[PDB]
Amino acid sequence: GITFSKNDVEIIARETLYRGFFSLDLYRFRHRLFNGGMSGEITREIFERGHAAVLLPFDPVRDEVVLVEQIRIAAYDTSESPWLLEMVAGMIEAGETVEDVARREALEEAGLEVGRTKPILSYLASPGGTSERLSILVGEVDASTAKGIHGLAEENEDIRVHVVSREQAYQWVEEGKIDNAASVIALQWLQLHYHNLRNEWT
Amino acid sequence: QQGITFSKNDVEIIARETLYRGFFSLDLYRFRHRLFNGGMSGEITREIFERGHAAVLLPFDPVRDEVVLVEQIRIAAYDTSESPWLLEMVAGMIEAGETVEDVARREALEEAGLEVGRTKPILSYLASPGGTSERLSILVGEVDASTAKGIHGLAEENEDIRVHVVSREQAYQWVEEGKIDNAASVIALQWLQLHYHNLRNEWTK
Numbered sequence A: 001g002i003t004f005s006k007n008d009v010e011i012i013a014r015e016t017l018y019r020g021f022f023s024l025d026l027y028r029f030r031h032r033l034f035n036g037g038m039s040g041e042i043t044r045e046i047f048e049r050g051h052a053a054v055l056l057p058f059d060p061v062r063d064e065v066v067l068v069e070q071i072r073i074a075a076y077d078t079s080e081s082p083w084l085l086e087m088v089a090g091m092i093e094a095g096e097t098v099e100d101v102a103r104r105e106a107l108e109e110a111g112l113e114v115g116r117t118k119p120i121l122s123y124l125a126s127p128g129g130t131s132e133r134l135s136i137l138v139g140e141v142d143a144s145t146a147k148g149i150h151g152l153a154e155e156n157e158d159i160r161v162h163v164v165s166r167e168q169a170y171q172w173v174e175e176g177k178i179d180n181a182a183s184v185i186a187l188q189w190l191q192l193h194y195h196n197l198r199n200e201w202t
Numbered sequence B: 001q002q003g004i005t006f007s008k009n010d011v012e013i014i015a016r017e018t019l020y021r022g023f024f025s026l027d028l029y030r031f032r033h034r035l036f037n038g039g040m041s042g043e044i045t046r047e048i049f050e051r052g053h054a055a056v057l058l059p060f061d062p063v064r065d066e067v068v069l070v071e072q073i074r075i076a077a078y079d080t081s082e083s084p085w086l087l088e089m090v091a092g093m094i095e096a097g098e099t100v101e102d103v104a105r106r107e108a109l110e111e112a113g114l115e116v117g118r119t120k121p122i123l124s125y126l127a128s129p130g131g132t133s134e135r136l137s138i139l140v141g142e143v144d145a146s147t148a149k150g151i152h153g154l155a156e157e158n159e160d161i162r163v164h165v166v167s168r169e170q171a172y173q174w175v176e177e178g179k180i181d182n183a184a185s186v187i188a189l190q191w192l193q194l195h196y197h198n199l200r201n202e203w204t205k
């Protein structure tokens, strides 16, 4: 496994490069080198946007997945359309739990009540340049109750629910029709775990 | 089942503004877009972290069923991880005019000392598209893991990298346990866990 711990790095300072809705910070630090020495002072620009809870809504009776569609303007330059098919997800505020955020977002974004839950995994989105961590849960849902247009319109959140079979959702990953990290990770996990999960929940 | 509802015809990007430029940039996108229930939104603004795009290489030895991992410090992991040194895939920024495959092969040499034989695409994904434009394109690359050792990276760029070789099964168990928890490695190793049997047959023929 890994070689060094937090005993082996010192963050000297952090400087706010930009403060707005999100922040960009310059971390200044030194760290041990694999050759046995210490680095000089290194600086890295880090996008600070908090952390997220992600919910894979899975109906184990029907073997169906609920997806939410909404515009993500950052996708525009590299994608055929900025409207993406994604997992229910939202930002975790101070003092909130991953699971409470997932439930609230499932109601706001898909009109869905959630039953049992299990962790999938918690990942760093792109740790060379952002601190963001996203914690994914699978949540038991009745996909027949998932339909229509949701999102908080007063916060400019316009979301369309789509229900697909599990195998259909995974085919959409393999074809590139679903191509955001949270959904790819959740759906590849589901393809590796669905047999045991369906047995546990039925 | 149809799929997505709207296209680039259905959004108007009114303006982009660079709010910060250094090594990376933070841009403000200003736009309006079609709504599912009919009309057009008002003007919306979003802050978008712009850092270009990346090529990622999963180094897989199909003879030995082994993967090569690279270890380096990622200081952004500090606040939410036990250690900021992460076990990762070979990966590099794509510059103008260079292909995913060109970058993946070059970085495999610079970061791990690895010659790569055949390659195949895995997936191309958006890292976190609510706040960053970054797209990463993953290939799997054929390597001899018995050649993989030592300390690499470009010292002139303060890039200090240690090579590790483990079985595919160990790498995947480390994903399950949270010891590998960066998106590119999670996606690549979950793909490998779903596809390794056919891949080994293809590459040892």
Ligand SMILES: Nc1ncnc2c1ncn2[C@@H]1O[C@H](COP(=O)(O)OP(=O)(O)O)[C@@H](O)[C@H]1O
Residues within 6 Å of the ligand: A021, A052, A089, A090, A091, A155, A156, A157, B045, B046, B047, B048, B130, B131
């Ligand atoms: N990139 C951004 N720039 C500015 N505001 C944002 C950005 N991303 C999200 N917001 C604000 O936060 C709200 C919720 O964000 P949303 O993207 O729906 O949650 P998540 O990204 O966790 O799924 C948005 O309606 C918007 O007001």
Ligand SMILES: Nc1ncnc2c1ncn2[C@@H]1O[C@H](COP(=O)(O)OP(=O)(O)O)[C@@H](O)[C@H]1O
Residues within 6 Å of the ligand: A043, A044, A045, A046, A128, A129, B023, B054, B091, B092, B093, B107, B157, B158, B159
């Ligand atoms: N967040 C950052 N802030 C400042 N410089 C960076 C940052 N991330 C990477 N760099 C610089 O750019 C180089 C890019 O190396 P490369 O292997 O192409 O990218 P990655 O860090 O994504 O694997 C790093 O070795 C470092 O010198």
Ligand SMILES: [Mg+2]
Residues within 6 Å of the ligand: A088, A089, A090, A105, A109
């Ligand atoms: Mg959301």
Ligand SMILES: [Mg+2]
Residues within 6 Å of the ligand: A089, A090, A105, A108, A109, A157
């Ligand atoms: Mg929301």
Ligand SMILES: [Mg+2]
Residues within 6 Å of the ligand: B090, B091, B092, B093, B107, B111
């Ligand atoms: Mg790299």
Ligand SMILES: [Mg+2]
Residues within 6 Å of the ligand: B091, B092, B107, B110, B111, B159
């Ligand atoms: Mg490199």
